[PDB]
Amino acid sequence: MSRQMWLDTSALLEAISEYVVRCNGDTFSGLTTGDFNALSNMFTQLSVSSAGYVSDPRVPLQTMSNMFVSFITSTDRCGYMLRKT
Amino acid sequence: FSELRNFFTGDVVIRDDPFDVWDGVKATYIPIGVHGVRLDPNGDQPPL
C-alpha cells in the first residue's frame, strides 16, 4: 500500500538480514542471545498468518519471496506502485 | 637488709582510672540510596 508501508517492511526484511548475519555461527546450545531473540521474533512478524515459533525460518522467507516475484511481475497487480502519486 | 628488699622488689603498672567497658552491639544495617529502573538485557523473548 502506502509507499511508507513498503519502506517499513523493506526495513524489516533488511533488518532480518542484519540479524541473520549477526546470528551466523553464534547459535549455541545452552545460550540465549539477544540477537537470536530479536531474529526469531522478527521471523514471526512476516506472516500475518500464524505466530508460532518458526522451526525452519527458510519456509516463510521463501513463500514471501515467491509471492513477491509473482506480484512484481504481473502489471495488473503491482500497477498501482507505478503511478505518479 | 638491702638484699632482702631488692629480692622483694618488683614493679607493676596500673591504669589510674579503670577502663569503661561496654557490651557488644547488634550490627543493624539499613537501606540507603535511590534505585532507578533497569530494563531486561535480552529484550523480548522468543515465542512458544
Curated annotation (Swiss-Prot), chain A:
Which range is the signal sequence, renumbered to this chain? none
Q: Which cysteines are disulphide-bonded?
A: none
Role according to the record: Capsid protein which self-assembles to form the outer icosahedral capsid with a T=13 symmetry, about 70 nm in diameter and consisting of 780 molecules capsid proteins.
User: What family does the entry list?
Assistant: Belongs to the phytoreovirus outer capsid protein P8 family.
Record note on quaternary structure:
Homotrimer. Homomultimer. Interacts with host peroxisomal glycolate oxidase (GOX). This interaction mediates its relocation to virus factories peripheral to host peroxisomes.
Q: What is this protein called?
A: Outer capsid protein P8
Which organism does this record belong to? Rice dwarf virus (isolate O) (RDV)
Portion held of the full protein:
1 to 85 of 420
Swiss-Prot record, chain B:
In which compartments does the protein localize? Answer: Virion; Host cytoplasm
> What is the annotated role of this protein in its UniProt record?
Capsid protein which self-assembles to form the inner icosahedral capsid with a T=2 symmetry, and consisting of 60 P3 dimers.
**Protein family (similarity comment):** Belongs to the phytoreovirus inner capsid protein P3 family.
Spell out the subunit comment: Homodimer. Homomultimer.
Q: What is this protein called?
A: Outer capsid protein P3
Name the species this protein comes from.
Answer: Rice dwarf virus (isolate Akita) (RDV)
From which residue to which, out of the full length, is covered?
972 to 1019 of 1019
